[PDB]
């Protein structure tokens, strides 16, 4: 369950962003600090990945034998997560440099907890000159294990395999076209129902649509999302707008749409605000798509659940918190909307994009 890059980005066709929560150390910071405490770049200036706080591990207690005159009042300890800056999926050089930079930083962390335990990281350059650390927030410390003891257990810092996630960015117009291997990988999502493409065609035969194939693609994508949220709201007892699961004898069994177990139920988690996709269609085509969605919910779910799931997304509701809504693909001067997906688990097809210890 993580926060990924929010700044505007652009790529020719598709972007890949990797994530790796580390084991063997913690970052301690003042409470309510920003997630990012630093980043790693190539010597040439290319930003590779961010250093972020991940899971809160409890309050920070400075070891008494490392008293230094400093505050450490209300500091929290967190796990560290390495979050890559997205690159083109076909860019072997950029993909490889990210991996190698992550493996090198684990090496640098290993020495840091050995000689500088409970000290902040310093902005340094790698011994070979390839990688450079930039510190964005000096108000932090890095400590071995859980950060309770003054000394480490001699940990070798590694890229934790259970700590891995991937984020794929593709043109919104491509979802449902099966055009590229990545589009096919995303279309294999268990919640995605391709049959809704042919279903839409039967529904709109007497309608003179501007782009029938595009409208069918959008209808299948949104409908599959709206239907999966309804399925999840019922399975987990999630409150969506004014829908009360308890009204349908459903015991609330999760902390909203953002709860990690809900996010993992998607497997391939949509990360872009669903209401954005309507922009890739003409005002008329968008109206036609939106008009046809409600009955798809109403034939499967209660009026209350259907109207609430439909209104939530129409009004710009997100699938799982802050969306990546400013990403674009294609022509630099005439960009097409990009839509992002978080792989909760990394499949075999995306494994080569991750650093392997």
């Amino acid at each position: 369950t993580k926060a990924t890059p929010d700044f505007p980005t652009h790529f020719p066709k598709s972007s890949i962003g990797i994530e790796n929560e580390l084991a063997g150390l913690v970052v301690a910071m003042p409470a309510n600090s920003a997630q990012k405490f630093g980043y790693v770049k190539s010597a040439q200036g290319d930003a590779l990945f961010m250093l972020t706080k991940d899971m809160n591990q409890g309050s920070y207690q400075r070891p008494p034998s490392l008293q230094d005159g400093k505050n450490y009042q209300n500091w929290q300890t967190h796990t560290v997560e390495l979050v890559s800056y997205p690159c083109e999926m076909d860019d072997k050089a950029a993909v490889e440099t990210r991996k190698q930079a992550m493996l090198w930083l684990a090496t640098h962390f290993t020495t840091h907890i050995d000689q500088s335990n409970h000290q902040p990281l310093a902005p340094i350059q790698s011994e070979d000159g390839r990688f450079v650390i930039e510190i964005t927030n000096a108000k932090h410390v890095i400590a071995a294990g859980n950060g309770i003891s003054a000394e480490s257990q001699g940990q070798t810092i590694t890229m934790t395999p259970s700590g891995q996630q991937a984020t794929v960015g593709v043109a919104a117009k491509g979802f449902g076209t099966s055009a590229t291997p990545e589009l096919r990988l995303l279309e294999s999502a268990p919640w995605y129902q391709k049959s809704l493409k042919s279903q839409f065609a039967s529904l709109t035969s007497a309608e003179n649509l501007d782009d029938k194939e595009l409208a069918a693609n959008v209808f299948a994508y949104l409908t599959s999302i709206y239907l999966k949220t309804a399925e999840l709201a019922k399975k987990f007892g999630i409150y969506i707008n004014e829908w009360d699961p308890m009204s349908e004898q459903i015991t609330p069994n999760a902390n909203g749409l953002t709860d990690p177990k809900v996010k993992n139920a998607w497997e391939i988690l949509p990360r872009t605000k669903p209401s954005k996709i309507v922009e890739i269609l003409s005002k008329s085509d968008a109206k036609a798509v939106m008009k046809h969605i409600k009955p798809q919910l109403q034939s499967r779910y209660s009026e209350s659940l259907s109207k609430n799931v439909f209104q939530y997304f129409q009004d710009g509701g997100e699938v799982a918190g802050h969306g990546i809504n400013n990403a674009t693909v294609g022509d630099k001067h005439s960009p097409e909307l990009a839509i992002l997906f978080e792989f909760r688990t990394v499949p075999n097809e995306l494994q080569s994009y991750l650093p392997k210890t």
Side-chain angles (χ1 to χ4, degrees), residues 178-232:
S178 322
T180 68
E182 330 89 52
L183 281 169
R184 284 174 238 125
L185 173 73
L186 292 170
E187 279 162 20
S188 81
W191 52 267
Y192 180 67
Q193 310 184 50
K194 211 179 169 190
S195 76
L196 291 161
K197 274 169 60 62
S198 43
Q199 252 276 20
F200 188 74
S202 304
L203 308 172
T204 57
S205 290
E207 274 132 286
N208 290 265
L209 301 171
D210 300 275
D211 203 334
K212 291 143 201 179
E213 170 70 33
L214 193 73
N217 275 335
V218 171
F219 172 86
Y221 176 76
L222 285 180
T223 306
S224 302
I225 283 172
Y226 286 42
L227 294 187
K228 182 71 164 188
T229 97
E231 189 216 86
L232 292 175

Side-chain angles (χ1 to χ4, degrees), residues 278-313:
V278 139
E279 295 164 19
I280 84 154
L281 304 166
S282 62
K283 187 232 185 191
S284 175
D285 283 13
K287 277 185 166 180
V289 167
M290 291 316 290
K291 245 88 169 279
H292 280 89
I293 296 158
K294 10 191 174 192
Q296 298 293 331
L297 282 157
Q298 298 171 320
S299 64
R300 262 163 295 229
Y301 300 102
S302 71
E303 166 61 28
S304 189
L305 184 56
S306 299
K307 173 254 159 190
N308 280 278
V309 167
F310 187 88
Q311 183 203 4
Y312 175 75
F313 289 118

Side-chain angles (χ1 to χ4, degrees), residues 225 229 257-258 266 269-274 312-313 317-321:
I225 283 172
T229 97
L257 290 163
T258 46
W266 285 95
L269 178 74
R271 293 284 303 105
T272 307
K273 189 189 275 191
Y312 175 75
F313 289 118
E318 306 268 0
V319 165

Side-chain angles (χ1 to χ4, degrees), residues 10-15 87-89 171 328-332 336:
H10 189 93
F11 300 96
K13 80 139 176 188
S14 52
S15 65
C87 67
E88 254 285 324
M89 298 196 62
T328 50
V329 144
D331 181 23
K332 283 187 173 183
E336 299 125 64

Side-chain angles (χ1 to χ4, degrees), residues 29-330:
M29 293 199 88
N32 195 211
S33 285
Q35 254 205 332
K36 189 180 120 169
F37 60 95
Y39 64 95
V40 166
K41 63 185 186 183
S42 76
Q44 294 74 43
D46 316 294
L48 306 173
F49 63 85
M50 297 164 168
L51 278 80
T52 67
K53 58 170 179 193
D54 180 28
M55 174 120 66
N56 186 301
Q57 298 290 84
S59 280
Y60 177 67
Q61 300 301 124
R62 179 77 178 178
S65 73
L66 295 178
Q67 232 168 111
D68 58 5
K70 295 135 212 179
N71 69 355
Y72 310 110
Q73 240 64 261
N74 303 320
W75 279 42
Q76 304 280 295
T77 66
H78 296 260
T79 58
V80 173
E81 209 206 6
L82 273 26
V83 177
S84 80
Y85 285 97
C87 67
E88 254 285 324
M89 298 196 62
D90 301 27
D91 200 343
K92 192 186 264 77
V95 158
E96 220 58 35
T97 304
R98 271 144 176 84
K99 291 207 270 166
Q100 288 176 265
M102 287 192 173
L103 297 169
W104 163 72
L105 185 68
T107 270
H108 178 75
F109 275 140
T110 304
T111 304
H112 186 88
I113 68 167
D114 184 60
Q115 67 182 44
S116 297
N117 205 33
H118 295 260
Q119 282 184 47
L121 271 195
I124 60 105
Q125 192 176 92
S126 65
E127 211 64 36
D128 57 26
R130 285 153 61 84
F131 318 113
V132 181
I133 304 174
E134 290 279 35
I135 296 299
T136 256
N137 194 345
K139 221 158 178 278
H140 79 267
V141 305
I142 302 287
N146 57 186
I148 299 174
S149 305
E151 287 172 25
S152 74
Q153 274 173 288
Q155 293 98 319
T156 287
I157 301 307
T158 236
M159 288 312 108
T160 319
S162 58
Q164 309 178 304
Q165 289 196 85
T167 300
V168 174
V170 291
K173 67 155 188 179
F175 210 111
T177 70
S178 322
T180 68
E182 330 89 52
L183 281 169
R184 284 174 238 125
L185 173 73
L186 292 170
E187 279 162 20
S188 81
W191 52 267
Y192 180 67
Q193 310 184 50
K194 211 179 169 190
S195 76
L196 291 161
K197 274 169 60 62
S198 43
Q199 252 276 20
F200 188 74
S202 304
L203 308 172
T204 57
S205 290
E207 274 132 286
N208 290 265
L209 301 171
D210 300 275
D211 203 334
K212 291 143 201 179
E213 170 70 33
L214 193 73
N217 275 335
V218 171
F219 172 86
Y221 176 76
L222 285 180
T223 306
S224 302
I225 283 172
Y226 286 42
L227 294 187
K228 182 71 164 188
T229 97
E231 189 216 86
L232 292 175
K234 278 236 267 193
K235 150 93 173 184
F236 291 106
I238 307 155
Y239 280 82
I240 314 294
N241 274 11
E242 286 162 66
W243 185 73
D244 179 10
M246 213 59 251
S247 76
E248 284 173 41
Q249 299 85 53
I250 303 159
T251 292
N253 202 36
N255 316 128
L257 290 163
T258 46
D259 182 317
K261 65 181 180 163
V262 178
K263 286 186 172 186
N264 308 333
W266 285 95
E267 294 180 24
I268 299 175
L269 178 74
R271 293 284 303 105
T272 307
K273 189 189 275 191
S275 60
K276 291 291 285 185
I277 207 174
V278 139
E279 295 164 19
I280 84 154
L281 304 166
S282 62
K283 187 232 185 191
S284 175
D285 283 13
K287 277 185 166 180
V289 167
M290 291 316 290
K291 245 88 169 279
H292 280 89
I293 296 158
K294 10 191 174 192
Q296 298 293 331
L297 282 157
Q298 298 171 320
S299 64
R300 262 163 295 229
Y301 300 102
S302 71
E303 166 61 28
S304 189
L305 184 56
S306 299
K307 173 254 159 190
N308 280 278
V309 167
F310 187 88
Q311 183 203 4
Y312 175 75
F313 289 118
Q314 189 181 63
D315 300 4
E318 306 268 0
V319 165
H322 188 62
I324 305 158
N325 307 345
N326 57 1
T328 50
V329 144

